[PDB]
Amino acid sequence: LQAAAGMYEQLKDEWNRKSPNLSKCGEELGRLKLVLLELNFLPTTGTKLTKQQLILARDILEIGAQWSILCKDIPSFERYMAQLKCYYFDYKEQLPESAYMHQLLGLNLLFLLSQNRVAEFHTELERLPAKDIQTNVYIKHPVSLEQYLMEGSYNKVFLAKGNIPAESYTFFIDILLDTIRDEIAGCIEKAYEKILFAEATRILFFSTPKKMTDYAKKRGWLLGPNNYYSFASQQQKPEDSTIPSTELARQVIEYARQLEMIV
Amino acid sequence: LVSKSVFPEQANNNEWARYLYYTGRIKAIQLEYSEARRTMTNALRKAPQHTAVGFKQTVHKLLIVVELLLGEIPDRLQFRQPSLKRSLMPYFLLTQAVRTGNLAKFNQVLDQFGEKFQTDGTYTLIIRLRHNVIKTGVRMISLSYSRISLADIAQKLQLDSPEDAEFIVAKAIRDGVIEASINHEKGYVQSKEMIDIYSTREPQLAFHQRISFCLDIHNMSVKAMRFPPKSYNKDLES
Amino acid sequence: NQVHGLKGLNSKLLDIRTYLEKVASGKLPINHHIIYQLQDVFNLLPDASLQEFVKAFYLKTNDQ
Amino acid sequence: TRPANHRQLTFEEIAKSAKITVNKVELLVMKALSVGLVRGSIDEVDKRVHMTWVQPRVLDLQQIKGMKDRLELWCTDVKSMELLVEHQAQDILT
Amino acid sequence: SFLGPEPEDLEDLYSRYKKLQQELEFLEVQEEYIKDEQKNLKK
Amino acid sequence: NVEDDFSNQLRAELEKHGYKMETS
């Protein structure tokens, strides 16, 4: 019926290797929402009575979410996760505390990087305290990786520390070897007013023209070895104008109006 | 909640110091540190000698970390003058670590004082300094000189590689708190500078900003001035 | 006063326009003075820029 | 032909109209300035002759029409602008 | 905490307030007039 | 914080005598 312990509870079979399918776990969660109704209605208000109910509420939700990453059902995971986040944050000494709690937190963190919202990581990290309620061990990989990307390093970023957990963090790295590439590439657009093609490709870590083309589309850069890094630099220069006064001076209407009232 | 607060201009002194202070904590993690540091410095001054004391402590401790986040290098006078220097001593260590440009000292301090920081609510802000350790050191070197090699930046700061230092500077100029354009031809990092700002609106724009800010004081003052004597008239004054 | 000069200027523009058409159709006499006067406004070339002023006042208002 | 945005023409543009060499055009324009037929400046860094002043032109119909273009345009920019001047502190004109 | 005269509070809207409003409208007129006059003494 | 210039005093006087020859 549930996702609870014992194999008489239908989602539990999907969590274990009794159903080897990665998409029958995620799939089967939709049914499970009906069985969830009774187990999640009570513990959305915290009390020590509601402690038995909490564990089971979380079990159905976590298990389903975890398996989704393996087959890259990832957007569906992020809506499922949200519910888990509130239970992990709070509901102290009623057993949010599990092996599952740890795995789930790290999975979410990895995802914020996959969207490339640096900002989203910092707010989120603090929200859960997802760095001292299960500690930086597995959790360490996204936190350190986000700090390195923010810093501007693309050489101590790590992906090796994300393969220390194999709790389905192992499938996020796949889509975070994209992201490191993306970031180097944007920074290079800002970096050069114009430099040689040769000097810029070894830092991209592209060395085949196909790789150059692929990300160049995203940048707005035209052709493969040839690229126009220059767009971003061009933007700085207009401060030089003075000839059209109305906008350039600015707030000409505003300052006058208030001044007239006062006198 | 911060965004919704209009927080009135006619508010008590303790209210003013506390609001700016909260808004600063929120902004600092966000990578809006330029604004956070100004409100937080202001907050300490504005807060009293008596009622404020619990929160007050907390503003001076947090602020030292927050200023570093911008790339400010906080003075020794700041620590000595309220006479709290002892409690401030660990933050002082972070100030040194940020300046030098080497990560090893910054990571070590973060974990060791970790528990103490968490109370004050600093710990979330401490971890953000890792970008800042390097940033503050590249920032002094890029602004001061014109064209300097990534190789100079790396030897002085104790960065891993010139190449490493090259990505780090690229990201910063995108953030725009170091403002430069990099030419990786010969391999130097180049300063922005026009050697005349009269051809540009900037001296005018600077003056104009003050004029808006000034006008706000006049409008605020005319209304505020009559209100207490008016209140007294109806209630009857001896 | 500024409103009144600008409104005045609008008035003169209307009289000249309707007349320009009348000159073209009728072959009304062309007075050298009118053609020359209008020409001059166009040739001088407008240019205008940098302007600023003080902001001393705040301390004073605050002072009261 | 050109409105009151530019009375500046380049040497290159003057040469194209004239269908005389760029070198001789530069001397010719100078003689006209010298006599006083035309007034302006020559910036030979830029290579433009910026006309400050221009004389009474040939009396043809088309030329009567050129004047209309600027007068008509001016009528609409003044209306727009006149409203912005009234707008600022309308509470107090007294 | 709760207001003391609830019959005065329910009654007051219809009673005192309605009547007052006319007297207030004159008071508004006197405020604009002072400004005009103030600016006129300045001329 | 404390100025690096102090530490620089002893080091800077000595450097001067050698440097002029060493580099042009």
Side-chain angles (χ1 to χ4, degrees), chain A residues 4-30:
Chain A
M7 293 296 186
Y8 54 100
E9 298 286 73
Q10 60 180 90
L11 196 68
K12 198 59 191 170
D13 303 86
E14 321 289 292
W15 187 56
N16 295 111
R17 302 328 296 202
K18 293 289 310 292
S19 189
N21 296 295
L22 315 186
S23 59
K24 197 173 170 284
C25 189
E27 177 164 71
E28 198 172 291
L29 182 62

Short mmCIF file of all heavy atoms in Angstrom, two decimals, chain A residues 4-30:
data_model
loop_
_atom_site.label_atom_id
_atom_site.label_comp_id
_atom_site.label_asym_id
_atom_site.label_seq_id
_atom_site.Cartn_x
_atom_site.Cartn_y
_atom_site.Cartn_z
N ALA A 4 6.57 2.49 3.03
CA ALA A 4 7.14 1.89 4.22
C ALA A 4 7.94 0.55 4.08
O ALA A 4 7.80 -0.16 3.07
CB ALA A 4 6.03 1.63 5.24
N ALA A 5 8.63 0.21 5.18
CA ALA A 5 9.33 -1.04 5.35
C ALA A 5 8.55 -2.36 4.98
O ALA A 5 7.32 -2.26 4.94
CB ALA A 5 9.83 -1.27 6.76
N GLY A 6 9.25 -3.47 4.65
CA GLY A 6 8.61 -4.67 4.28
C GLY A 6 8.33 -4.59 2.85
O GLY A 6 8.27 -3.49 2.30
N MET A 7 8.23 -5.66 2.11
CA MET A 7 8.02 -5.65 0.69
C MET A 7 6.55 -5.74 0.35
O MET A 7 6.15 -5.91 -0.79
CB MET A 7 8.74 -6.87 0.06
CG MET A 7 10.22 -6.69 0.22
SD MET A 7 10.96 -5.29 -0.65
CE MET A 7 12.69 -5.77 -0.19
N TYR A 8 5.63 -5.54 1.37
CA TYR A 8 4.21 -5.66 1.19
C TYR A 8 3.70 -4.30 0.92
O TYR A 8 2.48 -4.14 0.80
CB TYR A 8 3.48 -6.14 2.42
CG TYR A 8 3.78 -5.26 3.70
CD1 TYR A 8 2.90 -4.28 4.16
CD2 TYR A 8 4.90 -5.48 4.44
CE1 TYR A 8 3.13 -3.56 5.33
CE2 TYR A 8 5.16 -4.78 5.64
CZ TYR A 8 4.28 -3.77 6.03
OH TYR A 8 4.67 -2.88 7.12
N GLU A 9 4.67 -3.30 0.83
CA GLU A 9 4.31 -1.96 0.68
C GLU A 9 4.94 -1.72 -0.73
O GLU A 9 6.12 -2.03 -0.88
CB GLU A 9 4.87 -1.01 1.71
CG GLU A 9 4.34 -1.39 3.12
CD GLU A 9 2.88 -1.01 3.33
OE1 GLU A 9 1.98 -1.68 2.74
OE2 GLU A 9 2.56 -0.11 4.17
N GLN A 10 4.08 -1.33 -1.71
CA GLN A 10 4.34 -1.43 -3.09
C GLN A 10 5.52 -0.54 -3.61
O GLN A 10 6.31 -1.00 -4.41
CB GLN A 10 3.06 -1.12 -3.92
CG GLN A 10 2.44 0.30 -3.74
CD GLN A 10 1.22 0.49 -4.59
OE1 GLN A 10 0.10 0.20 -4.16
NE2 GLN A 10 1.46 0.89 -5.88
N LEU A 11 5.67 0.74 -3.15
CA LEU A 11 6.77 1.54 -3.55
C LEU A 11 8.13 1.05 -3.06
O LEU A 11 9.15 1.29 -3.68
CB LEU A 11 6.59 3.07 -3.21
CG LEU A 11 7.52 4.14 -3.92
CD1 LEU A 11 7.16 4.18 -5.39
CD2 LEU A 11 7.49 5.51 -3.18
N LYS A 12 8.17 0.28 -1.95
CA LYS A 12 9.39 -0.20 -1.32
C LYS A 12 10.18 -1.12 -2.21
O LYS A 12 11.38 -1.13 -2.29
CB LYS A 12 9.10 -1.10 -0.03
CG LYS A 12 10.21 -1.34 0.98
CD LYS A 12 10.83 -0.11 1.67
CE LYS A 12 12.12 -0.22 2.52
NZ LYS A 12 12.65 1.08 2.90
N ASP A 13 9.41 -1.92 -3.03
CA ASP A 13 9.95 -2.86 -3.98
C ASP A 13 10.75 -2.10 -5.06
O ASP A 13 11.84 -2.54 -5.44
CB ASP A 13 8.79 -3.65 -4.63
CG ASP A 13 7.89 -4.41 -3.64
OD1 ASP A 13 6.95 -3.78 -3.13
OD2 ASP A 13 8.00 -5.65 -3.59
N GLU A 14 10.22 -0.92 -5.48
CA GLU A 14 10.78 -0.05 -6.50
C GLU A 14 12.08 0.60 -5.98
O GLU A 14 13.00 0.74 -6.74
CB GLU A 14 9.91 1.03 -7.09
CG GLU A 14 8.51 0.64 -7.33
CD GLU A 14 8.39 -0.36 -8.49
OE1 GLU A 14 8.62 0.00 -9.66
OE2 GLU A 14 8.13 -1.53 -8.12
N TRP A 15 12.13 0.97 -4.64
CA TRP A 15 13.30 1.58 -3.94
C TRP A 15 14.41 0.60 -3.97
O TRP A 15 15.55 0.97 -4.22
CB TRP A 15 13.09 1.90 -2.46
CG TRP A 15 14.20 2.65 -1.83
CD1 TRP A 15 14.66 3.85 -2.32
CD2 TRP A 15 15.06 2.37 -0.69
NE1 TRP A 15 15.73 4.35 -1.61
CE2 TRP A 15 15.98 3.45 -0.58
CE3 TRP A 15 15.18 1.26 0.15
CZ2 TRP A 15 16.89 3.51 0.46
CZ3 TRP A 15 16.05 1.35 1.28
CH2 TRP A 15 16.94 2.43 1.38
N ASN A 16 14.11 -0.69 -3.73
CA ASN A 16 15.10 -1.80 -3.72
C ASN A 16 15.13 -2.23 -5.19
O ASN A 16 14.52 -1.60 -6.03
CB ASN A 16 14.72 -3.03 -2.77
CG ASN A 16 14.72 -2.51 -1.34
OD1 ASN A 16 13.62 -2.44 -0.80
ND2 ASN A 16 15.96 -2.10 -0.85
N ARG A 17 16.04 -3.28 -5.43
CA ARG A 17 16.39 -3.92 -6.65
C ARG A 17 15.39 -5.02 -7.07
O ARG A 17 15.58 -5.79 -8.01
CB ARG A 17 17.81 -4.49 -6.56
CG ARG A 17 18.95 -3.48 -6.23
CD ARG A 17 18.76 -2.07 -6.76
NE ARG A 17 18.77 -2.14 -8.23
CZ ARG A 17 19.03 -1.16 -9.12
NH1 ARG A 17 19.60 0.05 -8.64
NH2 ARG A 17 18.59 -1.24 -10.40
N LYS A 18 14.22 -5.13 -6.37
CA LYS A 18 13.11 -6.10 -6.74
C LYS A 18 12.49 -5.65 -8.06
O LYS A 18 12.31 -6.53 -8.88
CB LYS A 18 11.99 -6.02 -5.60
CG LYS A 18 12.45 -6.56 -4.23
CD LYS A 18 12.67 -8.13 -4.06
CE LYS A 18 11.46 -8.96 -4.55
NZ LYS A 18 10.18 -8.80 -3.71
N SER A 19 12.35 -4.30 -8.31
CA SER A 19 12.05 -3.79 -9.63
C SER A 19 13.27 -3.05 -9.98
O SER A 19 13.67 -2.18 -9.25
CB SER A 19 10.98 -2.73 -9.54
OG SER A 19 10.53 -2.38 -10.82
N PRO A 20 14.02 -3.41 -11.01
CA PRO A 20 15.32 -2.83 -11.35
C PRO A 20 15.03 -1.53 -12.09
O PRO A 20 15.93 -0.87 -12.47
CB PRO A 20 15.94 -3.76 -12.31
CG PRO A 20 14.81 -4.64 -12.91
CD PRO A 20 13.79 -4.62 -11.79
N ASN A 21 13.73 -1.31 -12.49
CA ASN A 21 13.37 -0.16 -13.46
C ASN A 21 13.47 1.19 -12.70
O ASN A 21 12.90 1.28 -11.60
CB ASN A 21 11.90 -0.29 -14.03
CG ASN A 21 11.77 -1.58 -14.88
OD1 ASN A 21 12.42 -1.71 -15.94
ND2 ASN A 21 10.78 -2.45 -14.53
N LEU A 22 14.14 2.17 -13.30
CA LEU A 22 14.37 3.52 -12.76
C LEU A 22 13.19 4.46 -12.93
O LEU A 22 13.15 5.52 -12.40
CB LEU A 22 15.53 4.19 -13.58
CG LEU A 22 16.83 3.48 -13.94
CD1 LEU A 22 17.96 4.26 -14.62
CD2 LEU A 22 17.39 2.79 -12.73
N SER A 23 12.25 4.04 -13.82
CA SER A 23 11.14 4.89 -14.28
C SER A 23 9.84 4.27 -13.91
O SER A 23 8.84 4.85 -14.20
CB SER A 23 11.19 5.04 -15.81
OG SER A 23 11.11 3.86 -16.61
N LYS A 24 9.92 3.14 -13.19
CA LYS A 24 8.71 2.57 -12.72
C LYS A 24 8.49 3.01 -11.26
O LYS A 24 7.37 2.96 -10.72
CB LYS A 24 8.85 1.04 -12.84
CG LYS A 24 7.49 0.31 -12.76
CD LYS A 24 7.51 -1.22 -13.02
CE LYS A 24 6.13 -2.06 -12.71
NZ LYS A 24 6.01 -2.22 -11.28
N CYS A 25 9.62 3.51 -10.58
CA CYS A 25 9.61 4.06 -9.25
C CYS A 25 8.97 5.40 -9.18
O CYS A 25 8.16 5.72 -8.30
CB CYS A 25 10.99 4.18 -8.78
SG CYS A 25 11.02 4.62 -6.99
N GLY A 26 9.42 6.27 -10.16
CA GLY A 26 8.96 7.62 -10.35
C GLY A 26 7.51 7.59 -10.74
O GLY A 26 6.71 8.41 -10.34
N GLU A 27 7.14 6.60 -11.60
CA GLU A 27 5.89 6.40 -12.22
C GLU A 27 4.85 6.07 -11.21
O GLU A 27 3.73 6.69 -11.15
CB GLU A 27 5.74 5.33 -13.28
CG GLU A 27 4.32 5.11 -13.89
CD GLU A 27 4.43 4.30 -15.21
OE1 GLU A 27 4.73 3.10 -15.15
OE2 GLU A 27 4.03 4.89 -16.24
N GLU A 28 5.26 5.16 -10.34
CA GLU A 28 4.44 4.54 -9.30
C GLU A 28 4.10 5.45 -8.14
O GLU A 28 3.09 5.20 -7.40
CB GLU A 28 5.05 3.19 -8.92
CG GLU A 28 4.15 2.22 -8.18
CD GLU A 28 4.75 0.82 -7.99
OE1 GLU A 28 4.93 0.09 -9.00
OE2 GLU A 28 5.07 0.42 -6.83
N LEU A 29 4.88 6.53 -7.95
CA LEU A 29 4.76 7.64 -6.97
C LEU A 29 3.40 8.35 -7.18
O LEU A 29 2.74 8.74 -6.21
CB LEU A 29 5.86 8.72 -7.11
CG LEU A 29 5.75 9.84 -6.04
CD1 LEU A 29 5.92 9.28 -4.63
CD2 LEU A 29 6.72 11.03 -6.31
N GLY A 30 2.96 8.47 -8.48
CA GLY A 30 1.66 9.14 -8.78
C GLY A 30 0.48 8.45 -8.14
O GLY A 30 -0.43 9.12 -7.60
#
